[PDB]
A paper describes a structure:
Periplasmic binding proteins (PBPs) are a class of proteins that participate in the cellular transport of various ligands. The structurally symmetric bilobal architecture of their fold has long been thought to originate from a duplication and fusion event of an individual lobe. Here, the crystal structures of two permuted halves of a modern ribose-binding protein (RBP) from Thermotoga maritima are reported.
RBP-CPN was designed to consist only of the βA–Eα1–4 elements, which are directly linked to α9. Similarly, RBP-CPC consists of the elements βF–Jα5–8 connected to α4 of RBP by permutation. An alternative explanation could be the formation of an interface between two crystallographic dimers, as indicated by an analysis with the PISA server. In this case, the C-terminal α8 would not originate from the same chain of the asymmetric unit but from its corresponding symmetry mate. The resulting extended arrangement is facilitated by an interaction of the βI strand and the residue stretch 116′–120′. The central β-sheet as well as all α-helices appear to be well ordered, except for the loops close to the unresolved region and the termini. The r.m.s.d. of 0.5 Å over 135 Cα atoms of the resolved residues, however, indicates a high similarity between RBP-CPC and the corresponding elements of full-length RBP. However, it appears that RBP-CPC, which still contains this corresponding helix 8, does not reliably form a dimer.
Numbering used by the authors:
A (entry chain B): 1 to 97, 115 to 142
B (entry chain A): 1 to 95, 115 to 142
Write the structure that this text describes.
């Protein structure tokens, strides 16, 4: 039933962080089977994402996926999963590159659609 | 030895959030005994802070203090601490090439946070 996941946020003071995450959540939050059990900044950085993911894996072992606000954080997350033997966890991300929406928000929307479609196929009810 | 704490940030897209937090950290980060174990927006909102703090207290029972980017969040955090029986936790709050008023308010709040907590928890 439930698909628990974690999210790695970018730098909290940087607008791309909010736009990517908000776009992602505009989609994923419509599918209540997806449960965000952890959400933390990894500062758009690979080494920080490794450290943060290592901690998330210990506190929330049930996660099936991690969505990341840039490629560097996804790479660090993937390394941490490998180091923990958690090669089962799926890693996703969007790297980019106010009234209305922009590039980072729409990219988060499309990334969220893919995240839902992929994970509902792997983990149907 | 160490003094773990949590920070409740304002609305992430609002510049006062960052001026206040950056001024606070310009002081606190110089003192290595203070360790920020959780940092999360509570949207400058009391009821959001209540819910966010309830979650932080369960993930990070080691915390001895919470610093908040406005009064509304401090009040929500205080209520959450009471609800969890954690009346031991101290709550604090305050309500770009140059520096501005919110930054200097954060600096003064951080100086007070350090002084107060170092008197409560001396080496």
């Amino acid at each position: 039933k439930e698909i628990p996941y974690a999210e790695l946020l970018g730098i909290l003071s940087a607008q791309p962080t909010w736009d990517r995450s908000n776009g992602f959540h505009s989609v994923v939050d419509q599918y209540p089977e997806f449960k965000m059990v952890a959400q933390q900044s990894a500062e758009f950085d690979r080494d920080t994402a490794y450290k943060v993911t290592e901690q998330i894996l210990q506190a929330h072992p049930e996660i099936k996926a991690i969505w990341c606000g840039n490629d560097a954080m996804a790479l660090g997350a993937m390394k941490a999963c490998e180091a923990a033997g958690r090669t089962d966890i799926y890693i996703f991300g969007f790297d980019g590159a106010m009234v209305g929406h922009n590039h980072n928000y729409y990219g988060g929307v499309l990334a969220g659609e893919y995240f839902v479609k992929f994970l509902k196929e792997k983990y149907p009810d």
